[PDB]
Design a protein around this ligand. Structure first.
Ligand SMILES: [Mg+2]
Ligand SMILES: [Mg+2]
Ligand SMILES: [Mg+2]
Ligand SMILES: [Mg+2]
Ligand SMILES: [Mg+2]
Ligand SMILES: [Mg+2]
Lengths: 140, 252, 119
RNA sequence: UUAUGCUAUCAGGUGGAUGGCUCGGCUCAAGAGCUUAUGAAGGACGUGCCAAGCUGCGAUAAGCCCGGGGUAGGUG
RNA sequence: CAUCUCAGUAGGAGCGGGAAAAGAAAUCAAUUGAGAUGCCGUAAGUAACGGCGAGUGAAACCGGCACAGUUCAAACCGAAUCCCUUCGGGGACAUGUGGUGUUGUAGGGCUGUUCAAACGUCUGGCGGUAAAAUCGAACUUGCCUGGAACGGCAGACCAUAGAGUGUGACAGUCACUUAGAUGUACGCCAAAAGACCGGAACAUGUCCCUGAGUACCGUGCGUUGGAUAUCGUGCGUGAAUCUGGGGGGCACCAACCUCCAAAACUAAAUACUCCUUGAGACCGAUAGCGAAAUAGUAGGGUGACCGAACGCUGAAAAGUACCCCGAGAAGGGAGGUGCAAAGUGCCUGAAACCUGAUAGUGAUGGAACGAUACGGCAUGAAAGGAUCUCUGGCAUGAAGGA
RNA sequence: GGUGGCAAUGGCUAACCUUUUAUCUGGGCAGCCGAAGCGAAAGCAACAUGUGCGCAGCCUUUUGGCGAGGCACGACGUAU
């Protein structure tokens, strides 16, 4: 706190000089007082007691990266500019495994012709891709 | 943009186009931040000894003895170990593990450096900042300035370029400091005259070295202290053609 | 010989105070007259008993005389003519400092003196 | 000439604050890093012309011999 | 508060060097890869543990610093080997000295062919590092003040040297230094160049060899994030050997991937500060180490052990001659030294406290020691006033108003 | 919180190297946060504007109109 603000105040913003003794003016040390006298604060902070669910090992689980069709469509010109994509006979041939994306979602609009190869496709993503005349290949 | 180039005789022998670093707006707060960060990073840890004032086995006498409740020596009545007792420890002293280094992002640090470099173009900032000069800012010199090897030649050039009165001002402004700093190594208070910039290491960094106030550096050694001593831009400086070449995209 | 890494006053005064007694011979240095410097090539020299000095600073500016004694530990020399009087009246030598004198006549009796002055 | 006293200032005593100075302390960095039965570190006693303490030294006792550096004084 | 935490902390016993420990996969991965160890960053307050409370708490992948691999036992040969020495000789050794050999998409020996010699050890000292140390520019110029110029006013120079200290007051040019160069015994390092043991492939197989109370397992306890899935070790039980054995976070079966334990050594990157050097938005004598060191001292305790205070004359001792008082080597007076008593624990020299003097008051008098207004007495030089202080006249005069 | 740099083609680097003595200049994409959520888990995967009221501001006959941000709906992803 601002020490110079309190030169000549005695109590230094604490009230009586009987406050600020030690751990008993805080109710215990740490998150102490779980549900006897700090129960309401315990519930509001996000420290409620309980155990709920299980965990799978991290060896087997994976966290897929995603990209929506709108995002993939809008930045296609920049992708071919960087040499990532390819523009043979007009339709963009864009491969998602060189970027680092394992699944294509479907939020947004698609207007350009896209030939997208990847591992996974939501149903709506495939519907939107092929309603614009494009094609999707399950990359293996 | 364009600026007159003057030889060692003081005659304009060309007109060189400046790079885009010199064309930027003045920003005092960024320069402030950069200079303060570097000066904070120079510092050096200090503090008392590990167990100072506490190597003791004092015990209190308790109540009933007619005296206070402070710890005292085992074979006497002299208080010890507490901050208000003579010879006792100090409450909240400095600590050697305190880390006082500051951080500045590279983009804003480069931006402050560019802002400080562009400030030397303005005659007003240079003039009101303390210096004395009779030249057309900015001062640009032909590349043979890196060939000078005797201090007398550098003095001749400075006299012919109207920048020697600042050197004399720095020489005669050297004066003894006041306070406890004299006993610790900082005996004088110096003044800042002129900064000479060269593209590459040459004998000029050894000739214009003893002149009072003059600091000579290469283009790859510019920071914010050199250009804003005390967080005030407007430092007299000299450049060369090679130095101008080095600054096409130097800090962008 | 103590390089620029000795810019702290504490270190310099330690070096000058607790010096080996063969280094305190160097602190007995004094300027040479014009002829001496242009015939030996050293801008200065050391003061030794038996040579004529010319006082340059203090109460005796311009008085000449021989050096009557030198003390290494004190760092002071004694000169002819320069004296102080007691209360009862007794002329006493007054110590000086060799950096306030000028050597006009060297005393060559060692033989090693010439080599000692230079190189 | 109102004594014993009260208040304020001045001169002096006692006392050792403040200021100025500081061969000391502390912290960080760079180096360097084992020794002793061929008797170590540490201790007791002795050793000086006048010498009690500390420092050095050991009945050859603030010390002896040789090589180099240094040059006119030395005797912590 | 008992499991938990404090914490493998404080403390103890043993061993030990300039470093130590570790270290060349019976490894980590996941479908397919990597390729000894240590230390730093991140993963991450995540997985995991837990009166599932408080709390405790990793590793692998990945990025860096620094890089280095090898030696035995056995299969084959059977004294072909080692060490001491008086150089005569003596000891070790068939219960095995020495040669070959050292590994996994197996290796080696036996049998046959080929290519020939990589890493390493020794001599060598070209050349570097290398003690005290040596050299190192340019003013001690004129007038003023002063006790004394490094200061003020004028003038003259140096700089690869304007870091700093000393000197009768502020010093690039007075001294030591600095920048930049030379010199060095004993030692250490090391390049050319010579000598020394020798290594790398291929073909053939009812052929021979490859680390035991060990690996694993039951059971108890400690420890761990280690959860039926960490490590240790008390007791008990206990294998195989290439057509083999181990691992892939509960046990078993199958497929697939990966390795070869129970013998040994090994530089560098790292940790620390008795000690040497450097630096400091550090302290400046009740501070900073307990100690500006006759300081672990004086002193205190039977003992384990606890533990202070004390810095400073002046430029130069020039450290008070001679005379009077006094019993005086006390001390005082007069008189000197010094710019100045600064007169010896002597720079400056505050307050409390004590002695004297000056102003006000005072032996009929009532108290938080003062604030405000009016008077007496004393002072009012500087730094405060001069249409200012005092006394009156005139003009305008708000609220109020006889 | 106050003040700043950069800005979905996002922001910042850590250890370390260049240090020429601790500064400093230039590298360093490992990694962290943001960019997609829901669910114990397997798993699945959304509006790059469809409607209205309307402040500031602008236009205007000074009464109305357009109306970023704001508020209220509608539609959609997932769990039950
Ligand atoms: Mg202390
Ligand atoms: Mg031992
Ligand atoms: Mg090992
Ligand atoms: Mg623990
Ligand atoms: Mg110098
Ligand atoms: Mg002390």
């Amino acid at each position: 706190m601002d020490t110079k603000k309190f030169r000549g105040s005695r109590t230094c913003g604490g009230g009586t000089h009987k406050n600020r003794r030690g751990a008993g003016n805080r109710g215990g040390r740490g998150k102490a007082g779980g549900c006897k006298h700090h129960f309401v604060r315990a519930m509001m902070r996000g420290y409620s007691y309980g155990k709920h669910g299980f965990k799978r090992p991290d060896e087997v689980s994976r966290d897929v990266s995603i990209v929506n069709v709108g995002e993939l469509d809008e930045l296609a010109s920049y992708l071919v500019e960087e040499g990532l994509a390819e523009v043979k006979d007009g339709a963009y041939h864009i491969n998602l495994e060189n970027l680092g994306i394992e699944k294509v979602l479907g939020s947004g609009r698609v207007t350009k012709n896209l030939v997208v190869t990847s591992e996974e496709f939501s149903a709506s993503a495939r519907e939107k891709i092929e309603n614009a005349g494009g094609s999707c290949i399950d990359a293996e | 943009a364009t600026a007159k180039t003057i030889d060692l005789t003081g005659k304009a022998v060309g007109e060189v186009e400046l790079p885009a670093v010199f064309d930027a707006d003045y920003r005092p707060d960024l320069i402030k931040k950069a200079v303060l960060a570097a000066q904070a990073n120079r510092l050096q840890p200090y503090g008392p000894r590990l167990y100072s004032g506490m190597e003791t086995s004092a015990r209190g006498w308790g109540s009933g003895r007619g005296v206070s409740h402070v710890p005292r020596l085992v074979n006497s009545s002299r208080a010890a170990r507490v901050p208000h007792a003579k010879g006792g420890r100090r409450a909240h002293p400095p600590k050697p593990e305190a880390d006082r280094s500051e951080k500045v992002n590279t983009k804003e640090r480069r931006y402050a450096i560019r802002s400080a470099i562009a400030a030397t173009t303005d005659p007003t900032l240079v003039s009101l900042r303390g210096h004395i000069f009779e030249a057309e800012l900015p001062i640009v010199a032909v590349n043979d300035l890196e060939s000078l090897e005797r201090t007398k030649q550098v003095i001749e050039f400075l006299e012919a370029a109207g920048l020697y009165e600042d050197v004399l001002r720095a020489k005669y402004g050297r004066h003894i400091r006041a306070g406890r700093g004299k006993l610790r190594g900082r005996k004088y208070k110096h003044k800042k005259s002129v900064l000479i910039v060269a593209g590459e290491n040459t004998p000029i960094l050894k000739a214009a070295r003893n002149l009072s106030g003059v600091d000579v550096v290469t283009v790859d050694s510019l920071n914010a202290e050199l250009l804003a001593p005390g967080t005030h831009a407007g430092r007299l400086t000299v450049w060369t053609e090679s130095a101008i070449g080095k600054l096409e995209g130097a800090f962008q | 010989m103590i390089a620029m890494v000795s810019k702290q006053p504490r270190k310099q005064r330690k070096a000058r105070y607790a010096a080996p007694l063969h280094i305190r011979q160097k602190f007995m240095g004094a300027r040479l007259s014009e002829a001496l410097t242009k015939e030996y090539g050293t801008r200065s020299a050391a003061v030794i008993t038996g040579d004529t000095v010319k006082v340059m600073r203090g109460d005796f500016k311009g008085t000449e005389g021989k050096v009557q004694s030198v003390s290494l530990m004190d760092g002071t020399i004694t000169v002819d003519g320069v004296i102080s009087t007691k209360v009862d009246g007794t002329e006493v030598p007054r110590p000086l400092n060799p950096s306030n004198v000028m050597i006009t006549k060297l005393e060559m009796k060692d033989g090693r003196r010439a080599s000692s002055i230079k190189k």
